[PDB]
Amino acid sequence: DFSI
Amino acid sequence: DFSI
Amino acid sequence: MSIAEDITQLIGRTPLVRLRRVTDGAVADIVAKLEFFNPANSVKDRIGVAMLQAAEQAGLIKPDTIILEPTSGNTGIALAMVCAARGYRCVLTMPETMSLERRMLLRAYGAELILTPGADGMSGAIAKAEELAKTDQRYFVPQQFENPANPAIHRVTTAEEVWRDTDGKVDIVVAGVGTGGTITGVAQVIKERKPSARFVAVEPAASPVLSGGQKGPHPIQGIGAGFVPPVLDQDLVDEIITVGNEDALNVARRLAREEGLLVGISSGAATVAALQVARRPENAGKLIVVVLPDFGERYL
Amino acid sequence: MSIAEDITQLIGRTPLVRLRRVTDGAVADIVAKLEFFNPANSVKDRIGVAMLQAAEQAGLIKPDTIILEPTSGNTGIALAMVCAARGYRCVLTMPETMSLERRMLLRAYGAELILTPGADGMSGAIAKAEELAKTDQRYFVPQQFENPANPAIHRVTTAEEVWRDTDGKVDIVVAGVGTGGTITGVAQVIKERKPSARFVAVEPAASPVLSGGQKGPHPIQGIGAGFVPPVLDQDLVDEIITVGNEDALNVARRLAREEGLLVGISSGAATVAALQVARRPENAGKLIVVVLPDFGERYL
């Protein structure tokens, strides 16, 4: 999943 | 051994 | 004397560098803003300190306050570094899918990690963070996707650095969108100051949410949140360019090998887009600023 | 406009930061010079570009020249980065004991690696480099331990940065010795300009060669070459402090957790020593500058  |  | 009082005073003021070889077909000048010059090697240092400064200035930080954020990315690293400098307790949630190397880096700054079910992804990390915040009032959650200090620091610092270092000549800014803070802050200042300036948002082709598509898994870390972040001002964005995984990886690799700029995948993605814009004949002679958000070594 | 033409123009000009918490018993002020602000995250960026600039200015670089150096450390990384910017072919030798992560980083900059027998250590990497240079005249070997451009760049840049940023108030410089270039260059300039200034060399207790002991294996990367480097001017060095492996590791960890400075082991070692010097009452009120040579993330 997204890594922000 | 050394790491330079 | 020029001595910083702590490491947080050395955040921002990142340099620009002209691209020389990764410029195939360009008729415009492409210069890159090197955000890996920040003390923890990414653009997120800017917001890590901003959101905490904002909280301090608003009297939201108490003697027993614990900083808490759901993040498997650079925001966790930035917050961990800023909490170490500040002397704050830092707790981060993230899916157990996060690499062991990343865990080690966060722990090195003294962050404490709460790992959530891998299959639940970010929503699981968020849910856990929501619950923890509710059940224990000691927790302060920056909320990077909604916090106004995110775009605000970009107005005050990033935007002015770009304005000054280009002596106002900047024509186009190209930036990947994660929280959307970088492009929003820069557009807010530069577009008002120079109405002819244009702003290009970049997102993964595999997760083309800003373009109207649906969320998907993708490896371009730092961008492609799979939703439209509240912090983003989509009315200041003049164009969206999607970038494929291979192109992003290829251009990232070209930057290291051909420019000596070891940068992350999202920097590859932003540069793919800057390269595409630079090829349009209407942009002949224009000055394009592309934001390179982080350092490549993190991606072994 | 403030735009670098290439990444090599952004080497050096590293900031100073006051240490606040890792200062137990100090009666002197300790400020750290943060060499991880260099584009490839170590002090070696300075000499990578210097030795190549020197070679270019002396007409030693030919159309078919291949850059070649025996190194398993930051010098390899710096040279690889500078060769990528320059467009030079870079070949490095090192024992196969070098981590796979380090190999990946060098290859990311487009360096080519020649791995030598693990049991033969650095002497094997050196021997191979000597032989390759002899049998093929295309190779240019910087020779970091003997090249005068090594201390020279430290005179011209590092020493002046320390002088200016402390407004000449610097009393003591503490630095780990690898090639000895950093401390030599800084001493050469500052000691002539301010004869009361003093210079402390740091080496591993496990390999106390400068103190009169014998070479030994040690984990404090970047220092402890196991011989007295020709580039070092031992007559400018006022004191040698040995540092143990545990103390170096412990203080390195303290710097990350308590100062938000994620630095390598050798930075831990230099700070151990700066802390020891700062505790002497004759040094009350003095200003100590400690060199922190690189970034901690490299050491996962």
Q: Return the CATH number at C278.
A: 3.40.50.1100
For chain A, how far is it from start to end, CA to CA, in angstroms?
A: 10
Q: Could you tell me the CA-to-CA distances from D252 to C19, C224, C262, D30, D287 in Å, in that order?
A: 36, 35, 25, 15, 21
Active site residues of C: 44, 266
Helix (H) or strand (E) holding C152: helix C149-153
Query: In chain C, what residues touch D257 (CB-CB under 8 Å)?
Result: 84, 108-110
- Determine whether the annotation assigns residue D226 to a binding site: no
Cα of A4 to nearest chain C Cα, Å = 4
Whether residues C115 and C156 share a domain: the answer is no
Do D226 and D213 lie in a common domain? yes
* Residue D273: partners with Cβ closer than 8 Å, 6 or more residues away: D174, D200, D202, D241, D243, D290
Mutation choice for A interface testing from C122, C143, C231 by most A CBs within 10 A = C122
Boundary of a domain, candidates C146, C175, C191: C146
User: Do residues D154 and D207 both lie within one domain?
Assistant: yes
Residues facing D176 on adjacent strands: D202
Cβ distance B3 to D225 less than 8 Å, yes or no, reads no
Q: Which of residues C146, C161, C188 is at a domain's end?
A: C146
User: Considering only CB atoms, which chain D residues are within 8 Å of C31?
Assistant: 3
CA distance D161 to D144: 22
Do both D23 and D156 map to the same domain?
A: yes
Q: Which domain holds residue D107?
A: 45-146
- DSSP assignment of C82-137 equals HHHHHT-EEEEEEETTS-HHHHHHHHHTT-EEEEE-GGGHHHHHHHHHHHHHHH-T
Residue of A1, A3, A4 with shortest CB distance to C179:
A4
Residues D137 and D170 in one domain: no
For chain C, helix (H) and strand (E) counts, in that order, are 9, 11
Nearest of C104, C14, C86 to residue C48 by alpha carbon:
C86
User: What's the Cα-to-Cα distance from D297 to each of C31, C102, C243, D17, D178, rounded to whole Å?
Assistant: 27, 10, 29, 19, 20
Query: What's the rounded Cα separation, in Å, for the pair D178 and C281?
Result: 52
Q: What is the Cα D78 distance to its own chain's centre? A: 11
> How far apart are the C-alpha atoms of D225 and D180, rounded to whole Å?
10
Please check if D14 is assigned to a binding site: no
Judge if C166 and C32 occupy the same domain.
yes
> What method did the depositors use to determine the structure?
X-ray
Reported structure resolution in angstroms: 2.1
Together in a domain, D26 and D161? yes
Contact C75 A4 (CB under 8 A): yes
**Quick one: three-class SS letters along D217-277?**
CCCCCCCCCCCCCCCCCCCCCCEEEEECHHHHHHHHHHHHHHHCCCECHHHHHHHHHHHHH
How many CB atoms are located within 10 Å of the residue C119 CB? Answer: 9
Helix (H) or strand (E) holding C18: strand C16-18
Q: Are residues C59 and C125 in the same domain?
A: yes
A2 to C74: CB separation less than 8 angstroms, yes or no = no
Are B4 and D179 spatial neighbours (Cβ–Cβ below 8 Å)? yes
Cβ neighbour number for residue D187 with a 10 Å cutoff: 27
**Alpha-carbon distance C62 to C140, whole Å?**
9
Check whether C48 is labelled as a binding-site residue: no
Beta strand C16-18 pairing with C29-34? antiparallel
CB–CB contact A1 C178 (8 Å): no
Question: Would you call D21 and C81 a contact, using CB atoms and an 8 Å cutoff?
Answer: no
Query: Residue type at C186?
Result: V
> Alpha-carbon dihedral of residues C156, C158, C161, C164, nearest 10 degrees?
-70
Q: How far is residue D164's CA from residue D160's CA, in Å, rounded to a whole number?
A: 6
Within this chain, do residues D267 and D189 fall inside the same structural domain, yes or no?
yes
Task: Identify which of C240, D48, D229, D61 has the alpha carbon closest to the alpha carbon of residue B2.
Answer: D229
> Do D15 and D119 reside in the same domain of the chain?
no
C173-198 b/e with 16+ CB inside 10 Å = b? Answer: bbbbbbbbbbbbbbbbbbbeeeeebb
The reply to whether D87 sits in an annotated binding site is: no
Domain boundary among C102, C128, C146: C146
As for how many domains chain C has, the answer is 2
CA-nearest of C179, C119, C127, C170 to C16 is C170
- Say yes or no: D176 and D200 in one domain: yes
The partner residue sitting opposite B4, judged by closest CB among D95, D123, D222, is: D222
How far is the C-alpha of C103 from the C-alpha of C112, rounded, in Å? 9
- Tokens representing C199? 């702003």
Q: Are residues D97 and D160 in the same domain?
A: no
Distance of CA C78 to the CA centre of its chain: 11
Closest CA to C176 of C271, C256, C246: C271
Strands (E), C96-238: 112-116, 139-140, 172-176, 198-204
DSSP secondary-structure letter at D283? G
What are residue D74's phi and psi, to 5 degrees? -65, -25
CA C161-C166-C171 angle, 5° bins: 110
Q: Do the Cβ atoms of C6 and D18 come within 8 Å?
A: yes
Interface of D with B (CB under 8 A): 71-75, 95, 97, 121-123, 144, 178-179, 217, 221-226
Are the C-beta atoms of D203 and D211 separated by less than 8 Å?
Answer: yes
Dist. CA D245–CA D272, nearest whole Å: 11
Q: From its phi and psi, is residue C282 left (phi > 0), alpha (psi between -120 and 50) or beta?
A: alpha
Q: Phi/psi at D58 (nearest 5 deg)?
A: -95, 5
**Sign, CA torsion C148/C151/C157/C159:** negative
Contact (Cβ atoms closer than 8 angstroms) between residue C34 and residue C47: no
Place of tokens 């002015």: C160
